Every structure is written in C-alpha cells, then in structure tokens.
Design a protein around this ligand. Structure first.
Ligand code: HEM
Ligand code: NA
Length: 334
C-alpha cells in the first residue's frame, strides 16, 4: 500500500509501474462495439486482476478512505431493502472467505458456528461478531463488509424471470445512482443505453445471468473515460465533476483524461439465491497508458472510430476531438 492518495481535490492518485502493467486494458480490437462479452470467472494469469475473485491492489487503503468520505456526506449510497438482509449476509460471507484465503497477509477469518472473528490488518480492524445478528456489528452487514472491499456492489433479487436492483453499495458509479435505480428490473435500469437493446445484447445477457449457478461465476469488462482520477462520478455530485469535461486542452490530455475500466463479477449467493454484481473500478491516466505503445495506438483507433451514440452516452463528446488529435501522435499508420 502506497501513501494515501486522493480521488478528489488534489487528485494525488497515481499508478506504480506494476499497477500500469496489470491494468485491464479493455480493447481486443481497434474498434469497440457492445456485445455479450461474458466469460467464466476462472482464476488465470498470476499477478493479474483475473487471479482471484476479488482483487485487492496497491490503492486499497486510499480507496477505502474515499469510500468513507462519500458515505460521510451521503449514507444513502448504500441501501438494502428488508427482503435482501439474508443476501447482505451472504455477500459478507463470500467476501470475507475469499479475502482471507487469497490475501492472508492482510485479512484473517476464524469461525465456530456463527461466532466469527475477522481481522483486517490493512485497516486495523479486529471484529468478533455473530453471523446473522445485525446488532453485533457497528453497521448493517452489506455496508460493513463493502467499507472494506474495493469497487462497487449491486445485489439483485432473482424473481419472476428477472433481476431487480434491491440492494447495493454504489459510491464510485460511472454516472448513475442506486437511489434512482432501486427496485428496477434488468432491462429497465439499462433503458438509457444506446444500440444494445435493438441488438439483443440485454435479452441475451439476462438469460445467461438468470442461469448462473453456485460455484460457476461469470465476468466481463466495461469501460469509459473520466476527467481526473475521480471515483465518485455520480449524479448526486455532478456540480463537482461535470464541468471538468470542459477543461481538456491539447497540452493537458495526458494528465486529465483517464481510461476507466470495470471488471465485473456476477456470482450466485448460496443461501439467498440472489446474484452479487461486483464492479471493480480501475483508473489509468493517458500519460501512464501511452507507456505501452500498443495500447496507445489501439486507443487512438478506438476513440477516432467510436460510434457517435456510444461516445455521447459515455460522456466523451465535449473533449473527443482534442483527445483524438493527441492520441494520433502514437499511431504511425495514421
Ligand atoms: C446485474 C448485472 C448488471 C447490473 C446491475 C448493471 C447495471 C448497469 C447500469 C446501472 C448501467 C448504467 C446505465 C445508466 O446510464 O443509467 C449499465 C450500463 C451498461 N450495461 Fe449493465 N449491468 C449489469 C449487467 C450487464 C451485462 C451482463 C451486460 C452485458 C453486456 C451489460 C451491459 C451494459 C452496457 C453495454 C452498458 C452501457 C455502458 C457503457 O457504454 O459504458 N450490463 N449497467
Ligand atoms: Na466481434
């Protein structure tokens, strides 16, 4: 864990060379188009973000501090409807189990029956509590555990052939809100997305997700851009970030524009049968990214050619020509 970094104000966040090397670059081709890009979430590539189900990285302590700030200002970024309480406990079990197994230097879990002892050595937490008993923890169980894991989470109720957004912790969203989307179904909350509905992407995706079983979780990547390493790009806070989209110049693209990638996990929760949706968010400035000349050239092509409805949905319109002009420098054929 490096020294404490900010994702707001002075934006001190930066990636080490190792974090650059493992950044989940999301473009298999020189152009991007939506698809059902799901794969089984099996361990691969030691040291990569795909090695464990939940990835903890050099930014862990910084990110937890950011989460704590968001929640101090707005506790309503976490919601669990009452029928989702068991699912919240399943989520806590899943995270503590995997984190203790995969990062034993940082986390420990010892259990006898419902008498659980969790230690997070990274954050200095030593908690004896009763699994299932919310009066035994300092806050509601989803909140408790997600205050200790990177990325956002949604917990979906599976009923009546569909998935409903009935719980979550959403403090680093790509410009959407849990309080807006609470209780919506799968196709409903995706209503703003261009193109993909007419393509069938959302019909096919719902079908795959409804069939996910215990022990066979699934993953995909999503991406966007963000100006500065701002994690909290929420509707709730738009006045704090939306104007920065007007601040990009030819000389500062490398410092301001960041590639944002979501490594998404979809995993069946064993007691409740709910689906856990992990949204693990990675950020990299374009100065850091263009250290890899293959990334740089591919990014130029993608951004130059991106369909306009998709660029507008993603929020890149305002600075796109500047960005494309800057990236052309790393594409010899261009
Ligand atoms: C339960 C699982 C999922 C949840 C909770 C979720 C949630 C969301 C949310 C809230 C948005 C933002 C919509 C907005 O602008 O207000 C979004 C966008 C998106 N979702 Fe999902 N989603 C899930 C699964 C999937 C899967 C499996 C796909 C497969 C393709 C998918 C494809 C997309 C696409 C293409 C967008 C637009 C993103 C962009 O252009 O950057 N989603 N999703
Ligand atoms: Na293809």
């Amino acid at each position: 864990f490096k020294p404490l970094e900010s994702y707001r104000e002075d934006f001190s966040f930066r990636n080490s060379p190792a974090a650059i090397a493992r950044f989940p670059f999301p473009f298999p081709e020189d152009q991007y188009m939506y698809s059902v890009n799901l794969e089984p979430a099996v361990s691969r590539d030691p040291g990569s973000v795909f090695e464990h189900q939940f990835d903890v990285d050099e930014h862990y302590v910084s990110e937890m501090a950011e989460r704590a700030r968001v929640l101090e200002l707005d506790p309503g970024r976490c919601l669990v409807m009452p029928h989702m309480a068991q699912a919240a406990w399943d989520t806590l079990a899943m995270l503590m189990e995997h984190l203790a197994r995969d990062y034993p230097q940082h986390f420990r879990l010892t259990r006898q029956g419902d008498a659980w002892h969790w230690q997070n050595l990274a954050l200095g937490i030593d908690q004896r509590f009763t699994f299932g008993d919310p009066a035994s923890l300092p806050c509601e169980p989803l909140e408790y555990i997600t205050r200790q894991m990177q990325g956002d989470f949604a917990v979906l109720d599976q009923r009546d052939g569909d998935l409903f957004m009935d719980a979550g912790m959403v403090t680093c969203p790509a410009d959407w809100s849990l309080r807006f989307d609470a209780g919506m179904s799968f196709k409903q909350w995706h209503s703003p997305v261009p193109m993909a509905h007419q393509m069938g992407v959302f019909d096919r995706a719902l079908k795959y997700l409804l069939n996910i079983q215990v022990g066979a979780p699934v993953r995909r990547l999503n991406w966007t851009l963000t100006i500065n390493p701002r994690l909290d790009t929420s509707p709730e806070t738009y006045h704090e970030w939306g104007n920065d989209r007007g601040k990009v110049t030819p000389d500062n693209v490398g410092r301001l524009v960041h590639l944002r990638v979501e490594l998404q996990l979809m995993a069946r929760l064993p007691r409740s049968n709910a689906l856990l949706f992990g949204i693990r968010t990675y950020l990299i400035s374009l100065d850091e990214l263009v250290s890899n000349p293959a990334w740089a050239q591919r990014l130029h092509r993608v951004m130059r050619d991106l369909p306009d409805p998709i660029a507008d949905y993603k929020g890149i319109t305002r600075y796109r020509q500047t960005l494309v002009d800057w990236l052309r420098r790393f594409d010899p054929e261009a």
